Amino acid sequence: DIQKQEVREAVELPLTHPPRGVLMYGPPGCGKTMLAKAVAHHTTAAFIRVVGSEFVQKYLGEGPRMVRDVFRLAKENAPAIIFIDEIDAIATTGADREVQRILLELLNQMDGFDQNVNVKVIMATNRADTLDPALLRPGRLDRKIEFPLPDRRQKRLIFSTITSKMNLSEEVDLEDYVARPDKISGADINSICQESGMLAVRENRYIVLAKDFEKAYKTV
Amino acid sequence: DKQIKEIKEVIELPVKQPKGVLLYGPPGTGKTLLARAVAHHTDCTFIRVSGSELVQKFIGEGARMVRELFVMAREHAPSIIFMDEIDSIGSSRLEGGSGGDSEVQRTMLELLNQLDGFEATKNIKVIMATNRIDILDSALLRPGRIDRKIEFPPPNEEARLDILKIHSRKMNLTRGINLRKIAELMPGASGAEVKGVCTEAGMYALRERRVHVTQEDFEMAVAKVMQKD
Amino acid sequence: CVSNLMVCNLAYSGKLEELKESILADKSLATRTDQDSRTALHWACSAGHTEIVEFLLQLGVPVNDKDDAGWSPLHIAASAGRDEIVKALLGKGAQVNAVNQNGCTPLHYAASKNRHEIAVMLLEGGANPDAKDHYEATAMHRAAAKGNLKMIHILLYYKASTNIQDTEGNTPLHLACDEERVEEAKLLVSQGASIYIENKEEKTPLQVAK
């Protein structure tokens, strides 16, 4: 609802036509692949998918040449929505600090490309306690987009954005199923709804009910 | 134009000797927009101290770099030094705020004594930004030998007509807009509300597919930044 | 086949004559339990078949049989969206304020998607408008959260309290401020919702709303 619309209006609306740094967060929800693939289907361009730990090797001069060549085909061919995953691991160990200063080097190379430039630098993470304060500095990452997990509001918002995609009976409840995580600590409510799809996918029942919501709450 | 105009004949003078400058006022915006926008018109690097965590490990591990920062400023001969993180209302106890702030006031004391001591390259500059009794402590410490003094007004209405004009020359704007009520409808606490109405209103000018930004759009972005404030 | 029991799959699939011949052939089939601790009445209330639950209630099936998760046939019928099944179960004497494992009532699930008929018929039978689950949350949290302003109003017809504190401490006015429904915020404030009551976050409903 608000995540696909914030990432959508922050990526594809400035793509062919003012932020550009879309930072995906949220450690409860796995995520980070439904939006990369959804972008890989809605937009038809070149995508250099990089798990992050792909350019950590003996070499030191090869990294900048790799991001500069991928940036020359990204800067030459199309507004590549290149997806950098798990920056928290490579954001803190001489190799890791080495790709940390390298990470600030490419963050300066997007600082030279203020915005509306040919190509775009999206970003994904799940741990913000290890992220440098210079990474989330405004002007660099102007959009801090969360995975809907804060207990009070965005839990119901992600209930709405997951009920907008999948089937639904009127048995879908919110009070006991958002106040239960308020009493006992729980995570990945979206992935627990997906587990309810993994218990209603047994082809016995045609419409999902709350027996797999509470049964998913007690089993997983 | 009242800040960049006064700042051009000091910053841009050794470009196309003043030792430092201080900026006082409520903790809004204009201390970094001026130093980094005019440092950006200088085409020079921007060297920050920013005493905090992860910087005593990231930029140097056991180096206070009070001279090594002038070695990085010696190799990077065009440079502008500015204190940004220390400008906070938290250093108000006048004991640990004045001691912890007095370590950086001493740092810029020995730095101004290095610029007065000798010069290895030109364009070396330092910019201060504080608002507390520490301002009066700096006036007790500055015996007024080598320092430049430039008045920095707070983000008032007169600091919004000119920053709205300078920050409105960049993008398109209609001529039938009143530059008084739209400046008065963005009260206190920064100028980044003005720059957020301009820059965040250009996305509504592109959304509406208009070639020029209208006054109703600036009002819309005023309401949008006032929903966030 | 929703369950291993054949008569439950006949109750869900709507096999009227085969379920009548099966239960008339063997009376025990109506009362048999499956792995989910459900009977034919539960699945027939899920599917919403009228004549099947009228044959089962005609033979005298227990109306308040709870499963492992506590779902009574009124929870599943009022939670299914069928008015006639609620008419039959309330006609037989179902518990208007029965609680499942988590503690919700069929009035709550009726109030989820703003079902007016099931709300008026359950509340008319003697349901509790201010009924609370284990998690301290009445139906006005569904009504204000899901945007069901008409459920707020018809719960106020039955004198529902507007200031039930949640397990965090938020009144239903905060959940009216969740969806940013200004009509629900102003209407609840006018009808008697207290803005002064705060949660553990020490935030008023006006501070949480944007």
DSSP string, A88-115: TGGG--HHHHHHHHHHHHHHHHHHSS-S
The answer, for A6 touching chain B at a CB cutoff of 8 Å, is no
Structure determined by? cryo-EM
The residue assigned the tokens 């989330």 is A136
**Considering only CA atoms, which of C159, C163, C158 is closest in space to residue C174?**
C163
Tokens of B229: 């404030």
Cα C147 to the center of its chain, rounded Å: 17
Distance from the Cα of A151 to chain C's closest Cα (Å) equals 10
Distance from the Cα of C190 to chain A's closest Cα (Å) equals 24
Question: Which residues of chain A make contact with B53, given a CB cutoff of 8 A?
Answer: 133
Torsion of CA C68, C73, C74, C76, to 10 degrees: 80
Residue C14 to residue C28: CA distance in whole angstroms: 19
How many A-B residue pairs are in contact by the CB < 8 A criterion?
Answer: 10
Q: Say which amino acid occupies C164.
A: I
Beta strands, E only, B49-121: 79-82
CB atoms within 10 A of CB B112: 18
Secondary structure class of B5 (helix, strand, coil): helix
* Cβ within 8 Å of residue B213, ≥6 positions away: B171, B172, B173, B174, B198, B201, B202, B205
Residue C84 to residue C74: CA distance in whole angstroms: 12
Secondary structure class of C133 (helix, strand, coil): coil
Tokens of A158: 């992600």
**Considering only CA atoms, which of A70, A16, A21, A67 is closest in space to residue A43?**
A16
Whole-angstrom CA distances from B50 to A27, B59, C12 are: 29, 10, 68
Q: Provide the edge-to-edge strand list for the sheet that holds B79-82.
A: B20-23, B126-129, B79-82, B45-48
Residue B171 to residue A15: CA distance in whole angstroms: 20
Residue B72 to residue A59: CA distance in whole angstroms: 26
Cα B101 to the center of its chain, rounded Å: 18
Axis crossing angle, helix A3-11 with helix A34-42, rounded to the nearest 10: 50
B213 DSSP β-pair partners: B173
Tokens of C16: 């009227």
Question: Which residues of chain A make contact with B52, given a CB cutoff of 8 A?
Answer: 133
Among chain A residues, the shortest Cα distance to B209 is held by A17
The residue assigned the tokens 């008065």 is B184
DSSP string, C85-130: HHHHHHHHT--TT---SS---HHHHHHHTT-HHHHHHHHHHT--TT
Tokens of C66: 């709870």
By the 8 A CB rule, do B1 and B38 touch?
no
Distance from the Cα of A217 to chain C's closest Cα (Å) equals 11
Residue A66 to residue A55: CA distance in whole angstroms: 8
Tokens of C83: 């008015």
Among chain A residues, the shortest Cα distance to C101 is held by A214
Q: Provide the edge-to-edge strand list for the sheet that holds A83-84.
A: A83-84, A122-124, A22-24, A143-145
Tokens of B17: 């000797």
Q: What phi and psi, each to the nearest 5 degrees, are found at residue A24? A: -95, 130
Residue C195 to residue C163: CA distance in whole angstroms: 9
Question: Which residues of chain C make contact with A163, given a CB cutoff of 8 A?
Answer: none
Tokens of A72: 């020359």
CB–CB contact B52 A132 (8 Å): no
By the 8 A CB rule, do C10 and C40 touch?
yes
By the 8 A CB rule, do C164 and C130 touch?
yes
**With the C-alpha atoms ordered B195, B200, B203, B207, is the resulting torsion angle positive or negative?**
negative
Tokens of A31: 């995520």
Whole-angstrom CA distances from B102 to B95, B108, B129, B134, C76 are: 10, 10, 14, 9, 70
Among chain A residues, the shortest Cα distance to C102 is held by A176
**Considering only CA atoms, which of C147, C140, C125, C146 is closest in space to residue C192?**
C140
**Considering only CA atoms, which of A110, A111, A81, A85 is closest in space to residue A10?**
A81
Contacts 24+ apart (CB under 8 A), C190-195: C191/C156, C191/C162, C192/C162, C192/C163, C193/C162, C193/C163, C194/C162, C194/C163
CB–CB contact B199 A133 (8 Å): no
Whole-angstrom CA distances from B4 to A176, B59, B80, B144, C64 are: 58, 30, 15, 24, 79
Q: What is the DSSP letter of B33?
A: H
Residue A41 to residue A20: CA distance in whole angstroms: 19
B129 DSSP β-pair partners: B23
Stated length of chain B: 229
Question: Which residues of chain C make contact with A184, given a CB cutoff of 8 A?
Answer: none
- How many angstroms separate the most distant Cα atoms in chain A? 59
By the 8 A CB rule, do C64 and C95 touch?
yes
Residue C136 to residue A176: CA distance in whole angstroms: 9
Secondary structure class of B45 (helix, strand, coil): strand
By the 8 A CB rule, do B200 and B224 touch?
yes
**Going by DSSP bridges, is the β-strand pair B20-23/A143-145 parallel, antiparallel, or unpaired?**
unpaired
**Going by DSSP bridges, is the β-strand pair A22-24/A122-124 parallel, antiparallel, or unpaired?**
parallel
* Cβ within 8 Å of residue C182, ≥6 positions away: none
The residue assigned the tokens 């301002």 is B135
CB–CB contact A176 C3 (8 Å): no
By the 8 A CB rule, do B11 and B107 touch?
no
Residue B148 to residue C205: CA distance in whole angstroms: 51
CB atoms within 10 A of CB B115: 19
Q: What phi and psi, each to the nearest 5 degrees, are found at residue A63? A: -55, -60
Burial annotation B188-221 (CB, 10 A radius, 16+ → b, else e) = eebbbbbbbbbbbbbbbbbeeeeeebbeebbebb
Torsion of CA C138, C68, A181, C168, to 10 degrees: 30
Q: Say which amino acid occupies B97.
A: G
Axis crossing angle, helix B158-166 with helix B192-207, rounded to the nearest 10: 40
Burial annotation C76-89 (CB, 10 A radius, 16+ → b, else e) = bbbbbbbeebbebb
The residue assigned the tokens 């506590």 is C70
Resolution in A: 8.3
Stated length of chain A: 220
Cα C36 to the center of its chain, rounded Å: 19
By the 8 A CB rule, do C178 and C145 touch?
yes
Residue A138 assigned as binding residue? no
Residue B106 to residue B112: CA distance in whole angstroms: 10
Closest to B202 (Cβ–Cβ): which among A18, A100, A132? A18
Whole-angstrom CA distances from B73 to B68, B79, B129, C75 are: 8, 6, 20, 74
**Considering only CA atoms, which of C111, C65, C89 is closest in space to residue A172?**
C111
By the 8 A CB rule, do C61 and C69 touch?
no
The residue assigned the tokens 């639950």 is C53
By the 8 A CB rule, do C39 and C30 touch?
yes
Q: What is the DSSP letter of A147?
A: P
The residue assigned the tokens 């590549």 is A80
Q: What is the DSSP letter of B46?
A: E
Residue C140 to residue C151: CA distance in whole angstroms: 8
Secondary structure class of B198 (helix, strand, coil): helix
Residue B224 assigned as binding residue? no
**Considering only CA atoms, which of A36, A1, A8 is closest in space to residue A143?**
A8
**Considering only CA atoms, which of B144, B114, B149 is closest in space to residue B7?**
B149
Residue C194 to residue B188: CA distance in whole angstroms: 32
From the number of C-beta atoms within 10 Å of its C-beta (0-12, 13-18, 19+), residue B228 rates as exposed
Secondary structure class of B126 (helix, strand, coil): strand
* Cβ within 8 Å of residue B33, ≥6 positions away: B191, B195
Residue B47 to residue B38: CA distance in whole angstroms: 14
Closest to A183 (Cβ–Cβ): which among C67, C135, C145? C135
The answer, for A18 touching chain B at a CB cutoff of 8 Å, is yes
* Cβ within 8 Å of residue B225, ≥6 positions away: B186, B193, B196, B197, B200
Torsion of CA C155, C160, C162, C166, to 10 degrees: -100
CB atoms within 10 A of CB A219: 10
CB atoms within 10 A of CB C206: 12
Closest to A175 (Cβ–Cβ): which among C2, C113, C133? C133
Question: Which residues of chain C make contact with A175, given a CB cutoff of 8 A?
Answer: 104, 108, 133, 135, 137, 141-142, 145
* Cβ within 8 Å of residue B77, ≥6 positions away: B121, B122, B123
Distance from the Cα of A125 to chain B's closest Cα (Å) equals 19
Burial annotation A76-108 (CB, 10 A radius, 16+ → b, else e) = eebbbbbbbbbbbbbbeeeeeeebbebbbebbe
Residue A207 to residue C2: CA distance in whole angstroms: 11
* Cβ within 8 Å of residue B169, ≥6 positions away: none
Residue C7 to residue C3: CA distance in whole angstroms: 9
Question: Which residues of chain C make contact with A171, given a CB cutoff of 8 A?
Answer: 76, 79-80, 109, 112
Residue A197 assigned as binding residue? no
**Considering only CA atoms, which of C39, C37, C108 is closest in space to residue C79?**
C108
B138's torsion region: left (phi>0), alpha (psi -120 to 50) or beta? alpha
